[PDB]
């Protein structure tokens, strides 16, 4: 029931699908040879954003990579400008920006408002913080898609049969609309953080993956991502390499 779960061994995912498709069972087995743990998110249609929020903040907490925080803060500030250039007035998003930025600061150590791993998890489980951080990612993702509407247009109208702004208002901005590859391209482009997604689906049997990053998403043609997510229909969970 919590928004973000505790770390589990991959064997619990394996037990969960012990009567499932043999293809899925073998992919889970392959997953367990490279990954030590899994962290689930509640399946409410915000899983990609919620799993990204936790794994990213936890990554900063554990690495104390202050230079990475400074980098994303610069990107976050330019996400504010893309939203303003599209006509979003600041009161529509300012609370989403300030709450996420507060978590970025809180997870860096050495000042009055620093927090630890337990309080971070506590905050990602609190709706009045977790949902605001999710809405930040949704607004940042929506702005990046609209800013590059002409580039995204053929892909969105091949997937759906709607315009770009239609897609953003219907399936990016509202809470509970689960993310697809268009969300993940736009978010990783907007924030500049690579994301590895492992696909636990029915396609030799292997677990397909894709690395989303400003470099990999470029149409002209790096470092392995430090965020790894597991995708199933309706689910994005956090994977921990071994």
Question: What residues are annotated to the active site?
Answer: 44, 47, 209, 235
Q: Is 208 helix (H, G, I), strand (E, B) or coil?
A: coil
> In which element (H, E) is residue 52 found?
helix 47-63
Main-chain phi, psi angles of 239, to 5 degrees: -105, 140
- 224 DSSP 8-state letter: P
Nearest to 141 by CA among 78, 191, 88: 191
- Separation between Cα atoms, residue 157 and residue 242, nearest integer Å: 40
What pairs with residue 231 in β-bridges?
A: 199, 236
- Separation between Cα atoms, residue 202 and residue 21, nearest integer Å: 9
Dihedral (C-alpha) 123, 210, 14, 127: value to the nearest 10 degrees? 20
- Separation between Cα atoms, residue 206 and residue 35, nearest integer Å: 14
Taking a C-beta distance cutoff of 8 angstroms, is the pair 124, 57 a contact?
Answer: yes
Nearest to 136 by CA among 220, 224, 46: 46
Full strand arrangement of the beta sheet holding 195-199: 4-9, 35-41, 235-241, 228-232, 195-199, 209-212
What pairs with residue 7 in β-bridges?
A: 39
Vertex 236: Cα angle to 231 and 240 (nearest 5): 85
C-alpha distances out from residue 17 to 13, 97, 177, Å: 7, 39, 25
Nearest to 74 by CA among 108, 106, 104, 109: 104
Taking the alpha carbons of 88, 89, 90, 95 in that order, is the dihedral positive or negative? negative
Taking a C-beta distance cutoff of 8 angstroms, is the pair 190, 182 a contact?
Answer: no
Q: Is 161 helix (H, G, I), strand (E, B) or coil?
A: coil
- Specify whether domain 1-41+194-242 bears CATH 3.30.1240.10: no
- Separation between Cα atoms, residue 130 and residue 78, nearest integer Å: 23
Tell me the two tokens of residue 75.
């990107």
For 42-193, CATH number?
1.20.1300.20
Taking a C-beta distance cutoff of 8 angstroms, is the pair 50, 121 a contact?
Answer: no
Taking the alpha carbons of 160, 164, 165, 168 in that order, is the dihedral positive or negative? positive
C-alpha distances out from residue 68 to 61, 75, 129, 191, Å: 11, 11, 22, 11
Resolution (A): 2.3
Q: How many CB atoms lie within 10 A of CB 85?
A: 11
| Residues carrying CATH 1.20.1300.20, the chain | 42-193
| Residues carrying CATH 3.30.200.60, the chain | 1-41+194-242
Taking a C-beta distance cutoff of 8 angstroms, is the pair 162, 135 a contact?
Answer: no
Q: How many CB atoms lie within 10 A of CB 97?
A: 20
> Experimental technique used?
X-ray
Chain-centroid distance, C-alpha 120: 16
- Separation between Cα atoms, residue 66 and residue 88, nearest integer Å: 30
Tell me the two tokens of residue 172.
């990016």
- Separation between Cα atoms, residue 113 and residue 96, nearest integer Å: 19
Tell me the two tokens of residue 184.
């993940």
- 102 DSSP 8-state letter: H
Q: Are strands 4-9 and 35-41 parallel, antiparallel or unpaired?
A: antiparallel
Q: How many CB atoms lie within 10 A of CB 110?
A: 7
């Amino acid at each position: 029931l919590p928004y973000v779960g505790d770390k589990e061994p991959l064997s619990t995912l394996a037990a969960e699908f012990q009567s499932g498709s043999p293809i899925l069972q073998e992919k889970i087995k392959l997953l367990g040879e490279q990954y030590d743990a899994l962290r689930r998110t509640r399946g409410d249609g915000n899983c990609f954003y919620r799993s990204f929020m936790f794994s990213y903040l936890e990554h900063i907490l554990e690495t104390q990579d202050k230079a990475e925080v400074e980098r994303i803060l610069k990107k976050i500030e330019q996400c504010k400008k893309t939203l303003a250039d599209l006509g979003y007035i600041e009161f529509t998003f300012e609370d989403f920006f300030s709450i996420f930025i507060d978590q970025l600061e809180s997870v860096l150590q050495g000042h009055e408002s620093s927090i630890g791993a337990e309080e971070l998890l506590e905050r990602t489980r609190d709706q009045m913080v977790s949902d605001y951080v999710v809405m930040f990612f949704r607004f940042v993702t929506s702005g990046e898609i609209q800013r590059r509407a002409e580039f995204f247009e053929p892909f969105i109208s091949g997937l759906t049969n709607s315009t770009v702004v239609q897609f953003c208002k219907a399936s990016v901005e509202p809470m509970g609309e689960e993310s697809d590859h268009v969300h993940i391209i736009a978010l990783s482009d907007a924030l500049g953080v690579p994301i590895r997604v492992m696909y636990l689906d029915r396609s030799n049997i292997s677990v397909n993956h894709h690395d989303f990053s400003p470099e990999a998403n470029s149409s002209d043609g790096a470092e392995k991502p430090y965020i790894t997510l597991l995708y199933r229909p309706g689910h994005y969970d956090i994977l921990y390499p071994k």
